[PDB]
Amino acid sequence: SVYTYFSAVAGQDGEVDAEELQRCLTQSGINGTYSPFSLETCRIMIAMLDRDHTGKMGFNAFKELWAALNAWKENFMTVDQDGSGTVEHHELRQAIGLMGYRLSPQTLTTIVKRYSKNGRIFFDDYVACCVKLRALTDFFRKRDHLQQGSANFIYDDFLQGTMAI
Amino acid sequence: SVYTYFSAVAGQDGEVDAEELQRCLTQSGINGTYSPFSLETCRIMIAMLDRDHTGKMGFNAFKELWAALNAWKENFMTVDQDGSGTVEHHELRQAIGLMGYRLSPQTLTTIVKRYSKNGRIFFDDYVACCVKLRALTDFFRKRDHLQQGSANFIYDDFLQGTMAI
Ligand SMILES: [Ca+2]
Ligand SMILES: [Ca+2]
Ligand SMILES: [Ca+2]
């Protein structure tokens, strides 16, 4: 069980940091034949749910992450129509739609260019993208309760929410 | 010159991607006895100046980056008053002030937690921090029309500016 691996890598504090999380996820086999997650992707995964700002992730938060990772993995396989093991612009656009985001062509362009390596978006980068989209949206939503699609941010708040990710 | 190193790694399009930039900067000696830059840091250095959204860096952008890196390098030497080769909370506070940014102790704490390892911020992470602070502050300033320290953002705009870095 992935939960058994969590316990095995948790260490003395019963919670995982980026490095421990990377070990747990790699042992889980969630990445299949794709490359394991990078330390950076695991760090952002933690930042996404680090409500207490401790740089670590508790088990209950991990259950939420695991659920999200499996949904994102299915989306990846769904949109990877050519089975390249990489997500191209039109595929990523589809995945973004599957996740519920309504983004402009330019934003999509920016995202593809930012996450591409040698021309392609591999699983690790794809997941990192999904994580950041969710983390940034969580922050934005706290300033957009009416869900109007706009929000005011004081500079300091803006940096706190974005620099933490 | 550093531009000689740029020309040595530049692609046939006269630009460099994150990996080619990494090689150029390693040859430049901007780090001295410090470590080379991580791929992630080089990727955001490119993003910071990717005004034409090509995911690559041309000569003009590199010259701008080189100037910024030297500014950040000099600031690093200035604030690392105990010669630890690393920047601690108090020292980063000074550096952020030298960069012309005014943030709260709370935001400072968020930044230190994000980039420090055992209380120390090493060169690569320090530069990554400087890059993101500049990029996000410039993005915020563009929307802060009245220059009052607060700005309203359309959701998609917010995501493009933040996902870009
Ligand atoms: Ca632990
Ligand atoms: Ca594909
Ligand atoms: Ca120091």
Domains annotated on chain A, with CATH: 1-165 (1.10.238.10)
With CA atoms as reference, report the closest residue to A38 among B68, B54, B151, B39. Answer: B39
Which technique was the structure solved with, according to the deposited record? X-ray
Tell whether residue B82 is among the known ligand binding residues.
yes
Specify whether the CB–CB gap between A69 and A61 falls below 8 A.
no
Local structure of residue B120 (DSSP, 8 states): B
Residue type (1 letter), B41: T
A110·B163 Cβ contact <8 A = yes
Round to whole Å and give the CA distance between B6 and B24.
5
Specify whether the CB–CB gap between A40 and A30 falls below 8 A.
no
Resolution of this deposited model, Å: 1.7
Where residue A100 falls (left for φ over 0; alpha for ψ -120 to 50; beta otherwise) is: left
- b/e sequence B120-148, b meaning 16+ C-beta within 10 Å: bbbbbbbbbbbbbbbbbbebbeebbeeee
Tell whether residue A86 is among the known ligand binding residues.
yes
A156·B50 Cβ contact <8 A = no
Kindly report the nearest CA distance between residue A23 and chain B, in angstroms: 19
- b/e sequence B56-91, b meaning 16+ C-beta within 10 Å: bbbeebbeebbebbeebbebbeebbeeeeebbbbeb
B107·A159 Cβ contact <8 A = yes
